[PDB]
Nucleic acid binder design. Structure first.
Ligand SMILES: [Mn+2]
Ligand SMILES: [Mn+2]
Ligand SMILES: [Mn+2]
Ligand SMILES: [Mn+2]
Ligand SMILES: [Mn+2]
Ligand SMILES: [Mn+2]
Lengths: 163, 163
DNA sequence: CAATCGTGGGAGACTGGTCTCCCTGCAGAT
DNA sequence: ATCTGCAGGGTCTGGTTCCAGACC
DNA sequence: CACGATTG
């Protein structure tokens, strides 16, 4: 029936799949805030929970979320942000009725044959264009790869297959 | 007269002050999980949300939460954790109807004159024992300093004063 | 606005300065 | 079960008993 | 991935 997918980073997205094969994809809401006298983007907690409140996806729907796995060479702020986005999303999903399943990036990439691309984000939008043709206008820009990975997470949880 | 205080780390706690001067304090729920073939503690998302929903504090009650401020010398896992813990609590508090006010640790310590101690954990427990003498039996171990800081955070928000 | 690049970084409270503040993760001692 | 000491750290998944190769 | 930056 219903499946949710969540790419939790700042330019990520949430995707909702209906039993009737239709789909929705939403950019992660954010706000600009002051930290250490500079501007920083940060996920908008209250918009997120409101967004999840207005989904038609019923309670107990599974949400597939990408596991945070920051690289050891990433700085400590990157580690903080991936940690923070993960917790903010997971708690929002659990608080809104949804059962949360963390999926590693290698898993859903392996399942759609996306391993070791020269241009991994481009391929993601292509694969997601093919699984969700009606979302093809929403995947034209390079910054739309977050919408694609949300869709691909949901498509993975749903068990969809590429042609 | 209702105030919540949250110390968000893994040994932290949530303190709830009612308008009749009574007070509760609960340790942060956590679970043991496997990460890279060792065991770790992580906050327990379902249990925190169930606990927030059990509170009689009405909607819009302000929750004072200690701002995450990890040191540049702390490891990247330190930053991840405090990031994760902070977003999980913030999201959990907002979804449960409470207003979230981040408070720097320098603010509530200066408010109580705790700044610049050689035994800052002991002092917090001593100060919370005085503000909340019925919590004295619950503050006699050193590991209880998380209860102390949550109690003191809530005491900051409510405007209490040491005698 | 949309994209590309290179490196991995504190933050906060009372006209920049000064100063003080949190942890995690793992081992070892009782 | 409680405390202390000290340095600041990847994690995951197919494939086993430890690796190889991959990923944000 | 994040964070500052600079590119049309
Ligand atoms: Mn991602
Ligand atoms: Mn991106
Ligand atoms: Mn992404
Ligand atoms: Mn604290
Ligand atoms: Mn402690
Ligand atoms: Mn604490």
């Amino acid at each position: 029936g219903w499946v949710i997918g969540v790419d939790p980073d700042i330019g990520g997205a949430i995707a909702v799949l209906s039993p009737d094969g239709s789909s929705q994809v939403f950019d992660n809401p954010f706000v600009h805030i002051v930290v250490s006298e500079v501007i920083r983007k940060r996920l908008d907690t209250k918009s997120i929970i409101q967004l999840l409140r207005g989904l038609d996806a019923p309670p107990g729907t599974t949400a597939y979320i990408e596991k945070s796995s920051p690289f050891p060479t990433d700085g400590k702020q990157g580690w903080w942000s991936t940690g923070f986005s993960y917790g903010l999303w997971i708690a929002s999903l659990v608080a809104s009725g949804f059962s949360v399943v963390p999926i590693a990036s290698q898993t859903w990439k392996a399942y759609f044959g996306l391993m070791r691309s020269e241009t991994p984000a481009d391929d993601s939008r292509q694969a997601a264009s093919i699984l969700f043709p009606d979302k093809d206008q929403s995947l034209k820009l390079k910054k739309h790869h977050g919408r694609a990975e949300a869709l691909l997470l949901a498509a993975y949880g749903k068990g969809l297959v590429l042609p």
